[PDB]
Every structure is written in structure tokens, then in C-alpha cells.
RNA sequence: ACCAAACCGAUGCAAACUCCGAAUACCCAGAAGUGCCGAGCAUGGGAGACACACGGCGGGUGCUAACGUCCGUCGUGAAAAGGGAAACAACCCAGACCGCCAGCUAAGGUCCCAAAGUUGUGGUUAAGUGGUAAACGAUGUGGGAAGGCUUAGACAGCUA
RNA sequence: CCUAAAGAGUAACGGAGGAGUACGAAGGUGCGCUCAGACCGGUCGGAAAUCGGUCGCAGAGUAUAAAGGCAAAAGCGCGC
RNA sequence: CAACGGAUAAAAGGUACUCCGGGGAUAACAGGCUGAUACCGCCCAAGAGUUCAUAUCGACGGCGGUGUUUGGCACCUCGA
RNA sequence: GCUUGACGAUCAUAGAGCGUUGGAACCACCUGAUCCCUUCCCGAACUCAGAAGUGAAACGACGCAUCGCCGAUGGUAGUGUGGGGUCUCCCCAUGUGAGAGUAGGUCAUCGUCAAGC
């Protein structure tokens, strides 16, 4: 499922990261982190955009494969094209069994038709934000984090600290003391 | 229209639009954008025309927010007037525009109206266009 | 049109740069403020100018507190 | 040890500084060749006009 | 139930903003070789010139109009013939001491005008596109990666 | 001050502002001292007078535009 | 002596009654370059058309073409 | 080597904030204002004579990354030279190469002298 196959890559620069992307097809790429050395690698276009199609793609585990020798790594950062969209360039994490490290993850808003401020007073619900920065041990990072709004009335904000969280993860912008807003109910528009 | 409401100087140069939006290019307040894939200029007359477009096809709800300001100003030279005599009057606000900006951005519609809703803005605008969509990275 | 004016230039800045060997009386540097502060066997003039005192190279080291910039003169 | 240098393209219209680096070799005409000593600095005037030149290691 | 300093977070912009910050260019010193046998500097005899032009790059002005105009820095013309761009100061190649019914090349070219491949291999175009052009429109055609349905009968047509 | 292309210099009936003074102390030196602002408390003032405290550190000041400077303060007071 | 390297201690106008030396180094006419403007096309479609966007029109905005107006420049012609 | 004072080198990886701890000596608070000296008033500060009390305040030492401050590798932007395009902008060859961000570091490191072990 998750899976990427990689080359090891040792010609680096600005002239050599161009002609990559237009005679290969290919991805320039870094593998950090644990207790190792960075490394640079190559990777195809094609199996990295197939990849990110999925959802849970930037908080889920990805068996890396470079050669031959396997690694769990994890996308920590992307670059892309401003105009086309297409990734340029992407840098990996290394996971190690116990060392606390730091994910995006996605929020995923349910029973929103059934909120008693959409149906009594007529609301409409905006989403403020849509993913939430989490540091936790790697064996229990979540896909994606839970909200619901059934018990949400006109006017209401829903903030970090409302929103429960899987045992072991924590929201890190709240524990900097600062909550922010992720969903409300308004009144309409016209 | 859109101008800004003091300016520290009257009048600018007219400079030069050069590179790519590395910043201002990704979808930051809703779910679906118009983004701009031509480099050009936007004479917040042109804005203007392109959110009444916008919004009153929607016309049931949705979030919109315009990621462009017009803050440079530029002047014209009255008709008969020879070379020379001092720099122009300034006559309308414009915004400079890089290949990657998002101009518009909409929520709380469904995929289908915002990518026709989108079409309507981008035939008022003298650039080339293209929608996307918000990403987590 | 109602701008059309302007100064003569000042000819400021730096004169003799790192390493160069230097004679007493020497002006190292032209100013307005003090941009540069005068180190060892450097003058201050009274529009701010650096001058040398002694024989021997310009240094030009950042010290101290307050993040300053020096010229100082050196054994050659 | 040594290297031969050719010149292959006119010196009309090249900057100051390449003309210098080509006259600073011994070169004149174009298809003459010169026999130079393989030194740092001989190098440097080789590659600043690399373009004008032929070298035949 | 309107407005709201301030604060917190997210998010843009600046010739006369800057927590930052190149390449290059400029000073300085020490070295090898080359220099037409000199290059640098000083002092004297004689000047001319102080209407510049276009092309590239960085800018102001203009409408990022003009073979417009005003700067900076290179190249050419001025004061430079020869070959190429049909013709074409300023573009590309190249700097003409004289003679030869000798040879090799540059830019550009090789069916005839008109010197040299109707050369070889693999593709694309059917528009004389090539041999002038924008938003926008269209079952033109070549290639690539993926998807939705399908012998539990898919799509079109038809019988209800 | 910008144009002015990170040494100097650099044009336009290009974009913006000032000067044609002041001071016998507003100069010299020795000694000593730090501002603007916010909050709390306090008779008539009450957001803003003088007083006490905490924070603040230069967001003040500099005879006069703008730029560059200012803790050995170049800012402030006193004796000679 | 600010016209700020300051012609003299001391100085305004008219010429369609005019005159000489020159200049396409410099304007008016026509030509050229450009195309802001002008004119002519097209794109989008809120709307008008009883209903119905395109029979006929078409707001807010966008893209071209022609040299065709008003202009910009000053390249040719002031021994016409 | 251990502790405290004076003077430096270096100017945040050295700072801020929180917690604990130090009086044998030193230092600080402390008593008084006779005497030198002082306040545009006040022994508050400056100064003089010591000494009964205390480590409260201040200062020092030791902990913690919460804030601050440092910070790669890789990629991207820009750019000198030579050459191209569809030429208001880019691309290729060659040399060079940030800023931001990411992984991560940091509760400093030294020199001279004098008092006690
Ligand atoms: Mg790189
Ligand atoms: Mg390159
Ligand atoms: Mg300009
Ligand atoms: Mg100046
Ligand atoms: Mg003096
Ligand atoms: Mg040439
Ligand atoms: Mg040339
Ligand atoms: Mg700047
Ligand atoms: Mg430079
Ligand atoms: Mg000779
Ligand atoms: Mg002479
Ligand atoms: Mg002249
Ligand atoms: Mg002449
Ligand atoms: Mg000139
Ligand atoms: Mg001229
Ligand atoms: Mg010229
Ligand atoms: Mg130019
Ligand atoms: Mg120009
Ligand atoms: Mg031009
Ligand atoms: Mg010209
Ligand atoms: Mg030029
Ligand atoms: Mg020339
Ligand atoms: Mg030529
Ligand atoms: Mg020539
Ligand atoms: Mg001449
Ligand atoms: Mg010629
Ligand atoms: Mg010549
Ligand atoms: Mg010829
Ligand atoms: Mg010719
Ligand atoms: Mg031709
Ligand atoms: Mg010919
Ligand atoms: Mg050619
Ligand atoms: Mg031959
Ligand atoms: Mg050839
Ligand atoms: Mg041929
Ligand atoms: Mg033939
Ligand atoms: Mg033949
Ligand atoms: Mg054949
Ligand atoms: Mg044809
Ligand atoms: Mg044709
Ligand atoms: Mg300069
Ligand atoms: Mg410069
Ligand atoms: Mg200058
Ligand atoms: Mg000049
Ligand atoms: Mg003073
Ligand atoms: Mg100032
Ligand atoms: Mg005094
Ligand atoms: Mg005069
Ligand atoms: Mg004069
Ligand atoms: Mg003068
Ligand atoms: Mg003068
Ligand atoms: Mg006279
Ligand atoms: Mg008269
Ligand atoms: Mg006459
Ligand atoms: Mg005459
Ligand atoms: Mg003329
Ligand atoms: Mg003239
Ligand atoms: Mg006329
Ligand atoms: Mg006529
Ligand atoms: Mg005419
Ligand atoms: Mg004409
Ligand atoms: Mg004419
Ligand atoms: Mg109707
Ligand atoms: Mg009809
Ligand atoms: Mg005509
Ligand atoms: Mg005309
Ligand atoms: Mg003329
Ligand atoms: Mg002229
Ligand atoms: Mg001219
Ligand atoms: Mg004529
Ligand atoms: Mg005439
Ligand atoms: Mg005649
Ligand atoms: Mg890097
Ligand atoms: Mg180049
Ligand atoms: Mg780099
Ligand atoms: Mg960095
Ligand atoms: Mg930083």
C-alpha cells in the first residue's frame, strides 16, 4: 500500500536537478533523520504523484526501498511548482521506535447535515482550518483526527482544546497555549 | 473600487514583473481557487467585474475571499500633450500578478458551482487561469 | 513640474581597505555618523572622518559589546 | 607538463579581458598553436576563454 | 441584536521599508608565463574634437508606443573593404601590403535559376502549414500515464 | 533622499523635501543622571497636571529638512 | 552682483514697410515610424424582449484588426 | 583541584523565565550622623565611625528548552561567461549560489592576581 521504491543519487547541483526532471522523469529527494546520516535519492514522478492521491498519504508510515535495503521513513516536507502544481522535491523522515516526531493530519468533519445550528436556525458551517500540526510517538499517529458538529448551535466556535484527540497524541499549538478556531456556525450569507 | 486608503508617495515607477509566485500560491481559506498560470496585470476594474460575476452565480450560501489588492498606481498623459513637462496624473490602481498567484478562493459550495462559477470570473480577467484545489501539502 | 533639484555628491566611504599599508595622517575612512568607530592608533575627526597615527596595516575587526565595527592599524 | 593551444575563432568583437587572456598566452592568428607550461595559472587564462580556443591535452 | 482600539493566529505588497543577503565589479599584496620589444609614469612641441548613430544587457520617462527621449556598461558604424542575411551604415562570420587560372575552412548552405547530398537511418504534418496573428472554439491527428462500466451481457439503435 | 545597476561618479521641463540662519551659552572642562509610554493607588483636574510603586528599555531626545549616528551617551543638570 | 565663475558705475518695446548671413542642427503642408485615440470585428452573458440570454439587442469586463481621425516623434525637403 | 573578591579575553550556543541552595571567610544588607563630605527637601544616593543582628532583599552557584538565540543536508530563487527561443519573459552548457523553512543544538568557554581548604 504504502510503499516507494528509490536510487541512490550522486550527481547534485542546479544543472543536474534540471536535466532530472525533463530527460528522466524523475524526483530529487533527501532521507534524514534517526541516527544516521542525510542521503540523496531519486525517485519517479509517476510513483510519488500515484502515492499522493491518497488521503492519509502525510501521517501514515511509508516503507521506503532504497536499492535493495528498506527504511521507514515519512514525508515531512514537499516542494512544488507554483504554476503546473507538480512535486519537485521531497525530503523524508526517519521513524524510530521511540522518539517523539511531528505530523500534519487531516480533520475530518462528520454528521455536519444533522447540526442543530444548520436545521433550527438556518446556519452554515465554515471550516476554519482543515488539518492540525500533532507530535506523538510513531506507533500510535492517527490517519486522520475526529471532529464532530451535531451538538453545535448558531454562533458557536469550536476550538482545539473542544476536540478530542487519540491517547498519546498531542496538538503541540495547544500546548503553546494557543487555541484556535476550527469550525463555526454563521448566519447565511443572503 | 479597491485602492488603498493612504499612500505614503503619489505617484511609482513602472519597475518590471519578473519570476514565479513562490508565495501567495497555495489555497490558504477555502477549498476551491482560481489561480493565475499567465504572468500579467489586474486593474481593479477588472476584479471588480469578475466578483460580481462570481458571486452572483452562487447566489445561495459560500464563503468568497479576493487574494488581490490593487496598491500600485499608475498615470496616464493627457491627449494632445507633448514629451516631457513632468510625470502624469495618476488614473487607476492596478496589482501585479506572477504565474501561480490564487486570486478568488470559495468554500461551502459543491466541486461543480465553484468550477463554473470560477469560469464566469476568469472570461472578465486579460490572463489564463486554472482551478485547484486545497491540498495539505 | 516642481522638483527639479538636487546636491553635489560627498565622495564618502572607505579609502584604503584590509591589508593596505598606511602612512600617519593617512584618511581611512569618509562619513556621516559613525558607521565604523575608530580602533587602535585611529583619530576621529570632527565630521566623524578616520585618519591614521601610526605606520602599519588596516585591520578592519568587528568586537565587544554592541555588535561595532573597528579600523584599527597592525604591525605590517 | 606541456599543452597545445589553438586558436580557432577570431578575437574582432571579444571583450577586453578575453582578448588579454588569448594575447597572454602567445597567441596570434587564428590556427596558430603555442606550447605551454601546465601551471595553475596558465590554466586560468585557458578556461576565461574557453571558447575561443582548442586544446589538444 | 451596530461599531469597535488593542492582542493572538493565518495571509499578501514596497524606488524613496530592511531581521537578512549574492554573483559580478572594485581596492591591495605575492607569484609563473606572455607582451614586438614594449605595456606604465613624468616633462615638453603639434593637434583634432566637445551635432554622435544603431544593436545587446540594467534603468527613468512614454502607453515596459515609436528608426521616441535621457542615463550606465559592452559591440559595431563613424573612420572597415570581403562573405552571409533577396535587395539592406550599426545584425552574423571575418579585419584587405602586392601578385597567382594552387589548397583548407567560418557564417551560411548543397532540386533549377546558382558552386556543392534529388545523401543515409527513425518519426511527424496534408495545413502549400512550412512561407505573418490574440482571447476563445472544434469527434484533425501522433504519443504517455491512469480511471469508470462490461458474457451476473457493457455503449449505441429498436420493442414495451 | 530615490533614480544610481552592493567602491567613487552618473542625465531628464524625472519623483520628494529644506537653506540664504541660530547660540557669550545652545562653546570648554569636572562631577553627577537617564527617556517616551502603560497599569495600579491617591484632595478639588481626571483619559492627559503634581505624588508613590511596578513594567518598560529608547517605541524619547538631538536649535533647524532628510539621511547616517548617539552608553566613554553625541541626550539631561550643576560649579568653575 | 539670486541670470548666484558676477559683460557696464549706468538700459524697455514694435515691425504686416522691413533687410542680410545661415538651418530641414528646428516648426507649419504633404510622406515616413507608432497606434494612446478613432473606426471596424470578435469573447463572456446580468438583463430587455408577456414566458424565452443569443429573432433583434445587450450592462460590468476582455481580445484583436485597419492605417482611417485627433495626436506623439522630428527621419526627408528651408541654394523653394 | 575546591569557595569568594578585583581586573580582563569573548559578546546570547553565553540571554530571559522557573526551582533549589550559599554566611567558616569574603560580600551584601545593618547602627549612628560626633567628626571630613552630601541632598535645588530627605544620611534615599555620596561620605565618615564599626560589628550588635541576617543571608530576607541583592549577588553567586547548581538544575530545567517553556520563550529567545544558533542551525545543517537537500532543493529552490538570483547570477558571471558562451549560445538559443515563441524575445515586456525565459531556456541550454559551464562556474557560483542564497533568504525562508526542516532535522537538530544551547542553561557558555578561557587568563592574571589576592584571600581560606
Ligand atoms: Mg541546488
Ligand atoms: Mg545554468
Ligand atoms: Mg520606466
Ligand atoms: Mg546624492
Ligand atoms: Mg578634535
Ligand atoms: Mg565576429
Ligand atoms: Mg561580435
Ligand atoms: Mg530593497
Ligand atoms: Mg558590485
Ligand atoms: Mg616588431
Ligand atoms: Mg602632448
Ligand atoms: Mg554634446
Ligand atoms: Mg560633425
Ligand atoms: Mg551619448
Ligand atoms: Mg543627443
Ligand atoms: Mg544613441
Ligand atoms: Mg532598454
Ligand atoms: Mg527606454
Ligand atoms: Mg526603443
Ligand atoms: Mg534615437
Ligand atoms: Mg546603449
Ligand atoms: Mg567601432
Ligand atoms: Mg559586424
Ligand atoms: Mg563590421
Ligand atoms: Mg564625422
Ligand atoms: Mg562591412
Ligand atoms: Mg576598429
Ligand atoms: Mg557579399
Ligand atoms: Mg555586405
Ligand atoms: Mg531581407
Ligand atoms: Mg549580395
Ligand atoms: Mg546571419
Ligand atoms: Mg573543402
Ligand atoms: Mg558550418
Ligand atoms: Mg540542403
Ligand atoms: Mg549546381
Ligand atoms: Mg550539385
Ligand atoms: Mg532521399
Ligand atoms: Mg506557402
Ligand atoms: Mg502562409
Ligand atoms: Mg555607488
Ligand atoms: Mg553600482
Ligand atoms: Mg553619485
Ligand atoms: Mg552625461
Ligand atoms: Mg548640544
Ligand atoms: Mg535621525
Ligand atoms: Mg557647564
Ligand atoms: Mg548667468
Ligand atoms: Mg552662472
Ligand atoms: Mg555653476
Ligand atoms: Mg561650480
Ligand atoms: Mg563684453
Ligand atoms: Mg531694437
Ligand atoms: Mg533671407
Ligand atoms: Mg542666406
Ligand atoms: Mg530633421
Ligand atoms: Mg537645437
Ligand atoms: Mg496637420
Ligand atoms: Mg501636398
Ligand atoms: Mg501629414
Ligand atoms: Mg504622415
Ligand atoms: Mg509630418
Ligand atoms: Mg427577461
Ligand atoms: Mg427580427
Ligand atoms: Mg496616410
Ligand atoms: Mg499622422
Ligand atoms: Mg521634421
Ligand atoms: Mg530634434
Ligand atoms: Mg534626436
Ligand atoms: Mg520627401
Ligand atoms: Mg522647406
Ligand atoms: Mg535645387
Ligand atoms: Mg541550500
Ligand atoms: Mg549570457
Ligand atoms: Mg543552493
Ligand atoms: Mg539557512
Ligand atoms: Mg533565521
Known amino acids: ?190 | 473600487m479597491l485602492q488603498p486608503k493612504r499612500t505614503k508617495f503619489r505617484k511609482q515607477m513602472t519597475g518590471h514583473n519578473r519570476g514565479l509566485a513562490h508565495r501567495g500560491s497555495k489555497v490558504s481559506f477555502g477549498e476551491y481557487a482560481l489561480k493565475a498560470t499567465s504572468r500579467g496585470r489586474l486593474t481593479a476594474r477588472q476584479i471588480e467585474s469578475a466578483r460580481r460575476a462570481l458571486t452572483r452565480h452562487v447566489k445561495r450560501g459560500g464563503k468568497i475571499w479576493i487574494r488581490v489588492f490593487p496598491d500600485k498606481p499608475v498615470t496616464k498623459k493627457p491627449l494632445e500633450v507633448r514629451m516631457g513637462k513632468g510625470k502624469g496624473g495618476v488614473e487607476y490602481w492596478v496589482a501585479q500578478i506572477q504565474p501561480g498567484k490564487v486570486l478568488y478562493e470559495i468554500e461551502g459550495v459543491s466541486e461543480e458551482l465553484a468550477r463554473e462559477a470560477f469560469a464566469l470570473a476568469a472570461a472578465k480577467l486579460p490572463l489564463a487561469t486554472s482551478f485547484v484545489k486545497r491540498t495539505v501539502m | 513640474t516642481r522638483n527639479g533639484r538636487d546636491s553635489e555628491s560627498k565622495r564618502l566611504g572607505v579609502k584604503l581597505f584590509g591589508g593596505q599599508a598606511v602612512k600617519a595622517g593617512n584618511i581611512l575612512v569618509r562619513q556621516r555618523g559613525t558607521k565604523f568607530h575608530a580602533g587602535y592608533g585611529v583619530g576621529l575627526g570632527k565630521d566623524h572622518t578616520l585618519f591614521a597615527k601610526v605606520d602599519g596595516v588596516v585591520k578592519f575587526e568587528t568586537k565587544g559589546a554592541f555588535g561595532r565595527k573597528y579600523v584599527s592599524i597592525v604591525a605590517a | 607538463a606541456t599543452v597545445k593551444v589553438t586558436l580557432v575563432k577570431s578575437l574582432n568583437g571579444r571583450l577586453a579581458n578575453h582578448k588579454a587572456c588569448v594575447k597572454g598566452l602567445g597567441l596570434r592568428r587564428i590556427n596558430h598553436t603555442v606550447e605551454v607550461q601546465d601551471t595553475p595559472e596558465n590554466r586560468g587564462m585557458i578556461n576565461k576563454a574557453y571558447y575561443l580556443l582548442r586544446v589538444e591535452g
Open chain 1, 1 to 190: 500500500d504504502f510503499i516507494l521504491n528509490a536510487q541512490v543519487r550522486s550527481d547534485l547541483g542546479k544543472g543536474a536537478s534540471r536535466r532530472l526532471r525533463r530527460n528522466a522523469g524523475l524526483v530529487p529527494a533527501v532521507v534524514y533523520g534517526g541516527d544516521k546520516e542525510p542521503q540523496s535519492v531519486t525517485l519517479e514522478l509517476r510513483e510519488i504523484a500515484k502515492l499522493l492521491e491518497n488521503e492519509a498519504a502525510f501521517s501514515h508510515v511509508i516503507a521506503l526501498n532504497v536499492g535493495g535495503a528498506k527504511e521507514t521513513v515519512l514525508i515531512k516536507a514537499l516542494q512544488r511548482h507554483p504554476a503546473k502544481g507538480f512535486v519537485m522535491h521531497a525530503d523524508f523522515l526517519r521513524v524510530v521506535a521511540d522518539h517523539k516526531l511531528t505530523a500534519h493530519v487531516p480533520l475530518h468533519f462528520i454528521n455536519e447535515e444533522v447540526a442543530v445550528g444548520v436545521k433550527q436556525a438556518g446556519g452554515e458551517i465554515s471550516h476554519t482550518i482543515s488539518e492540525v500540526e500533532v507530535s506523538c510517538l510513531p506507533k500510535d499517529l492517527p490517519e486522520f483526527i475526529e471532529v464532530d458538529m451535531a451538538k453545535v448551535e448558531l454562533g458557536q466556535i469550536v476550538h482545539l482544546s473542544d476536540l478530542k484527540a487519540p491517547k498519546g497524541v498531542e496538538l503541540v499549538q495547544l500546548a503553546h497555549g494557543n487555541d484556535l478556531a476550527v469550525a463555526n456556525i454563521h448566519a447565511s450569507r443572503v
